[PDB]
Structure 1
């Protein structure tokens, strides 16, 4: 770990590129999501080691649930597994999203109140059946995502330079770092590169 002079208080993660990653390996589009679980756990372990206090993962949007059933079932399954795996570590977990929907996984309702697992060394938020319009209209201190603070640094995998409607209130001033590799090809150097960028701003 570099001797950072500064870290972001709050990083947002956009774990994009799972379908492209799968197709490149000769898999079906829906098979990439299960390969995005261990990267999230590796990113959690780095954040705990270096002292990042809060991480928000973009799980899936309301628009994502319009995708074919086989893809929706796979990404929902992978999101559930991610939250459950992180609950075995020292994470204070919160899931934010539209629970008044058939598309919100019932397995994740338990985590819609921030829950401390183990030593609670990092706060981890997950956006699940999330939509920016749902978030803003829920209401500014009363937006649906009000428990999620301002983001310092947003890191997106899969090479697209856009927010895909992640938390428009919290991302107003965020520095944005884009990794061209797809999310399942996560490496520590992607996070370290983004943190060097952040402290150099």
Structure 2
């Protein structure tokens, strides 16, 4: 009836800001950041075991340097809030912090490392992430390990398995997402948790992410249960 793992693509932040009459789209990102905090609280309280939030795609990283820097600061603030010790949430980065700049990477890593490995609620923060890239990096990790274990070249050709890839993703050892929520009426896909979401329920709302409400979350859960 209830998802174990909900994944959320937080779309529409800039559109939201423009609709509200703001010239600076960071107003959108800041409100989206507030909604991320809300959503994770809802998930925890509803008994969801794991939530993954899509904070920064590799696509996002191609944008105006100044705007991007501001966004990355908002994201780092978000993660630091997620990692607050009063929450007692276990947190994991999903993606490549090598892409966000070293000072933000240090701050993010520091926050995430401060969280317990064992907790009732787990949060994945997807930063500097792409789904196809993740699979490639999983394969490379898999093969690297096999080589270290004395695999021959011809053994490396046969070493790759579905289970071997799964075990080498960022999400190694976690249940796959049961429910993937996307906002802004986007029914495209965008490769978020590409491998892991192969059998996930998709749920869509027209509302932009900063406008996402607790009752929208309730509808998502109700729709999921009904399916």
- TM-score normalised to structure 2 length: 0.79
What is the deviation of 1:72? 1.0
* Match for residue 31 of structure 2 among 27, 35, 38: 35
State the match for 2:204 in structure 1.
Answer: 178
Instruction: Out of 160-169 and 8-17, give the one that drifted further.
Output: 160-169
* Match for residue 85 of structure 1 among 72, 78, 81: 81
* Match for residue 177 of structure 2 among 128, 151, 163: 151
Q: Secondary structure at the match of 2:189?
A: coil
1:71/1:148 Cα in 2 relative to 1: closer, same or farther (>3 Å)?
Answer: farther
Distance 1:168 1:114 in 2: 28
Distance 1:130 1:148 in 2: 17
1:72 aligns with 2:68: yes
What is the deviation of 1:131? 1.3
Gaps of 5+ in 1: 1-5
Count of residues in Structure 1 that have an aligned counterpart in Structure 2 = 195
State the match for 1:3 in structure 2.
Answer: none
- TM-score normalised to structure 1 length: 0.88
State the match for 2:42 in structure 1.
Answer: 46
Give the superposed CA RMSD: 2.0
Gaps of 5+ in 2: 140-164
Instruction: Out of 172-181 and 100-109, give the one that drifted further.
Output: 100-109
Q: Tell me which protein shows more helix as a share of its residues.
A: 2
> Does structure 2 retain, via aligned residues, the 8 Å contact 1:135–1:145?
no
> Does structure 2 retain, via aligned residues, the 8 Å contact 1:158–1:183?
yes
State the match for 1:61 in structure 2.
Answer: 57
> Does structure 1 retain, via aligned residues, the 8 Å contact 2:187–2:204?
yes
